[PDB]
Symmetry: D2
Subunit: 400 residues, 4 copies
């Protein structure tokens, strides 16, 4: 049987399995024992760890693993999207140390976004739940403009493409507005403000904010999502260009009717002050990598149409004035924000979040931007890499 | 436990003898064509044994072994449904449905400037070549027409393949759009000004006759030696009427955009020539598949282009390939593509297949009405969009799967 | 061998002149007996008409009244004013008025400003004080964007050219030019910045009072008012202007210590200042007269402020029509959305045309037609030649 | 009338020595070579002391122009005083040595000349006023004026715009104005159609001859050949206009470009060009011959477009600060018109970064800071500016 042919894969003709030897075997998969998809099995494990280490014969094991048996077998039969995760991890680690020596860039100074220039984190979450982090991946920071795809996805998920693009375009710019008196795309302030004005119309901005927070919670598999009121208050006083954009959008009747523009700006600053870590945000990115299903809970969070549209606009409009150079050389949908995050999606493989506060002169984190170039020079993750003929690039999706 | 031995019983149901037509029908249902260059030796020994045994058109397990030995590895992938699209017969009928549904779209004007860009507005063909060589066509797939601007990616690929990314893009940019960008470089190689500069990098220091022959040899390899020709009628008329291309040529000279030692008027003559190269949908679809297949021609197995050239060329087609429709196209279709004024759309679905749709009537942006309609429908049906998910794709069909 | 050497010019042999025959002769010059430069002489003339009846002036009853103003009166009667045959010129103004009166296109401004499309007036004030009006010339209307030159003139007069132009550019027209300065003071972003330089370190009530007292000097104290109705509606409908105000703040365009939202309220206020065509024509004549109000003789603006204001009106005055207008008309001009067109003919006269229905560029249909006709008739174009001008009339001439 | 100029010139003295009439004449600003004085200097070359019948025998034919001169009725009455101010202005710009000669014929950076011709024929020069140089883009007004004189405003402006640039073409696929290369090439293709370009060239030369009072107008084949070899941008503009169907039907674009290079290589001096500019200053009448050369509509349209489009990217700053119609050329000339007063030509080859002569541009700023010649100076209240049109 299934649990019986996973007991001998782990027990090497060796009668009973110590608990530490199943847990390391599991963690070697890249899964984390805190995975929400393994709770009942770790529940049954801290349950029988109270009948005091401990060692499991073939029926105590089966009593623990049957409830999660298929997820555990895909894990141990090297059937996950990256079969040799431990080797992949060391490459990610090599990449991390190589970006750490890049000291260019100036921390964002206009608010409050003066962190230390030494912070640098990278987190990975594959579409199968495999996790790895290195550096400062548990330090909270605000999403800033990396929330623009997340809220655009929510708007399309709830209302559909054709309604959303009555109000915002789908192409890069160079004006705020294009020739249809629509903002160019939802990845820029003029576009994201309009998108902010379509989410949950007909409810106050406090209930609106709760809905987006519940939505982001699903997207992160309930990992860390918070709010920084210091950044919200300080975004509010420094948002002169955003008020200019707000009034211009109102004068050009860009919003759906019944909108209170000044309130939408307040809501918009709020969404920009939402806090994440690199671990929690990399999971948000993996939901986008995984067709709308959160990879560590298995629930459908976004329509496949929402995810596709968002991945498309991140590809073409995601990195400010660097997005064309970025699309050419990196070939991955990505979104940078001014706190220094780069939300990065490798479709069908993984999502990631790099964070280092020092920005370059187009507003992208120097260390994150360096990491993304290096990552695609190593692995055939570029969108128009070939999955079969890829020269001397490494491919983490196949065996030895 | 022999390879030729257990492809014999896969095909021999009961029986120890396989009629030859029972092998040929099975072969073609995989989508391979008996003319495939990768099967030539086995097709030769099959017609030879039709000359050396008086009918009794039947293959025992050592007559089978004598014929398929040459190509047994390609043949088992075919018969073990290991090609990128295993149920090709079902997929083709979907292609056919899409063909017929675009056939009812009669908009658009045939190109008026010339010298027979005055084709019939009723010609409409689509050809498919997967990365494993499986082929299907429907409609007018054997009528010659000029590549026009569907040569811009191919020659950029040749230039990058010979010279590298970094040299080529000293001279042309890598982004969508006054002709020149902030660096007095053309915006990208998919627009006339960029393609004129790229044309001026291929095979420098050689006269325009070998320059042409060199590019012609290259397209032949990219097309697995299917039809690649040249229309001197179209060249002569592109030359007389290319007032704007001459304006671009001089502007590029004045802004020193060309390489040292370039003869501008000759480069423009070369440029019109490359625009008058002829294909069909079958031969061009194979060119598209070479780009879909990382640089290896899928029906010959030869490496034609570096994987760096193919990636660069696919990226710019994605962003700059469909004139002013390229953002809408990139959003809704999500595929690398290139339109030309003769009415072709070279189309690449990375890792699966290449296609060439051809219908002469263009819409107001210069794209074939029926081709553009065909491409929306295709991605509405199949999860080929660049950012479709290979695991969660709603009601979309996936031709890469079974059942 | 002076007051009595103008008495014989008016007295036909006769050594006694009836007052109405002096009044008729006076008004034929185009002067108004209400002219502030004639007040004393009209005072001593009504006093004499009180203290005696023989309504007749002997050679010192005349001399007792015109003594005060003898220099202006001799220039008037010796036909030394810029347009000597004013009665004939007037007759031409009337002809042009009637020909524009038959142009009924255009839509009135749709954001109350819903006036009548019937109103149509033109008033003329030469640089010597000669006046003429025809049509609806005493109806109040808001200056709207015809205040942009007047306030720029005030700012340069008080602060100088090179200070003001640290803050606003000087050339025709995305809101900001190549140097993160608005393009010129004749457009909203430029006018908002200019508004933020007038009378700094003062609350918006003295700022408004200061400009109103200034406009009064430019108008020789004819009607200058304020419409709170238009101000409230300018305040409610100014979404685009609120957008411009913030963009200017973000690109650090105001002078330090500016309250941007307050400046916008001042800006809406200045757009709601009210004039007639008569009072405004005098405002225009002040710019036409090198900075001196023509009906009081007072210096209102420095000649440098007037030049800069006239130079920018030429190039930036009529919204997107300013290139065609500068070609075909060649006169400094400024249109407003209430339907006025402030028009200056340098060295000759100022004018104010008013008709609310605007064409698609925001200019009064009738005013624009009047201005083309005027320059086809007279050699007032900036680059008409004063000696060889084909079939054009020259009103500065005694033909 | 002739007898009342005889006593005006003599102290009552006897008769008038001729050298003492010539000095009196030259002090008005008139030049004795003036074509309007041919007959009177003819009658003097026939004849050392003049009583009222030798005087009247010579001045009878020109007595009205001579009394206007001697009764101080010319546009600048105290010309000798004005002249010294021009000299001061010239000397003050002479010390501005920035700028680079155009490197696509290298003249000397030492040359610097200014010549003046009022609308009444009064002339003054300083510096290198007789050294020939090519007009380059200072022919664009002159070539536009000829076209409008012959064809009318509405025909010329089916083909060219009338507003500054800010694409070669505007919203109507017409070039922006005739003061830029794309506009001047179109203007060149309207002059004297239906005649080959050699006769076309002869005609513009005859036209420029009238505009200059038959002073020096020439042609430099060196500049023509070098314009031809260096004109890649002009060849690019030519083809773009052909594709966008901007020329009148029956145009041979490549030939028009050859004509266009020719017109830019026409040679003038500052003296002859100042007369050309004075013709524009004087409503189309040449001031040293009195003939109607251009329609008043052609001249007005030309002055309007020089004002707004004349000084390359400097035309907006220039129109504000100087307020005079002007056109600069890359050989270093600035054709400058003061409507109703005078025409001028400054020439100094070293150009600034916008393509305008450093010394000429300095002179034009200084000239308007000194005199109330700016378009929107007031003729009555002008602060401490000088007015050469008045007596004190
Ligand atoms: N790129 C960013 O993160 C900018 C966000 C910033 N709060 C804004 O809206 O202007
Ligand atoms: N766009 C096409 O398909 C061809 C373009 C055309 N041959 C040109 O060079 O202008
Ligand atoms: N009069 C006009 O042309 C516009 C005036 C108006 N108050 C504004 O600022 O927009
Ligand atoms: N700049 C000029 O005035 C003349 C030179 C110009 N490049 C031309 O010959 O067309």
């Amino acid at each position: 049987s299934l649990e019986d042919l996973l007991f001998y894969t782990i027990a090497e003709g060796q009668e009973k399995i110590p608990v530490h030897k199943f847990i390391t075997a599991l963690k070697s998969t890249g899964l984390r024992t805190s995975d929400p998809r393994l709770k009942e099995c770790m529940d049954m494990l801290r349950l029988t760890l109270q009948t005091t280490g401990v060692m499991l014969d073939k029926d105590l094991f089966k009593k623990c693993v049957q409830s999660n048996i298929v997820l555990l077998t895909q894990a141990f039969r090297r059937k996950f999207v990256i079969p040799d995760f431990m080797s992949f991890t060391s490459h990610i680690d090599e990449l991390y140390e190589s970006a750490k020596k890049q000291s260019g860039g100036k921390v964002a100074d206009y608010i409050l976004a003066k962190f230390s220039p030494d912070l640098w984190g990278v987190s990975v979450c594959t579409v199968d739940g495999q996790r790895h982090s290195t550096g400062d991946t548990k330090v909270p920071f605000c999403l800033q403009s990396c929330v623009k795809p997340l809220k655009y996805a929510i708007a399309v998920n709830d209302l559909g493409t054709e309604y959303v693009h009555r109000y915002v375009g789908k192409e890069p710019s160079g004006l705020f507005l294009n020739e249809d008196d629509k903002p160019h795309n939802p990845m820029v302030n003029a576009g994201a403000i309009v998108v902010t004005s379509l989410i949950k119309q007909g409810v106050n901005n406090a209930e609106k904010f709760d809905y987006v927070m519940q939505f982001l919670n699903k997207m992160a598999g309930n990992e860390y999502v918070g709010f920084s009121n210091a950044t919200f208050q300080s975004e509010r006083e420094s948002g002169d260009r955003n008020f200019a954009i707000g009034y211009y959008l109102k004068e050009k009747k860009c919003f759906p009717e019944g909108t209170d523009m000044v309130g939408i700006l307040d809501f918009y600053f709020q969404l920009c002050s939402i806090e994440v870590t690199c671990e929690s945000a990399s999971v948000m990115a993996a939901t986008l990598a995984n067709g709308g299903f959160c990879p560590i809970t298995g629930e459908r969070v976004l329509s496949p149409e929402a995810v596709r549209n968002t991945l498309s606009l991140m590809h073409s409009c995601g990195m400010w004035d660097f997005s064309g150079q970025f699309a050419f050389h990196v070939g991955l949908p990505a979104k940078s924000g001014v706190a220094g995050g780069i939300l990065l999606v490798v479709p069908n493989v993984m999502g990631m979040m790099c964070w280092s506060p020092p920005l370059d002169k187009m507003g992208n984190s120097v260390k994150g931007i360096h990491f993304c170039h290096d990552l695609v020079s190593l692995c055939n993750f570029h969108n128009y890499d070939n999955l079969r003929h890829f020269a001397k690039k490494l491919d983490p999706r196949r065996e030895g």
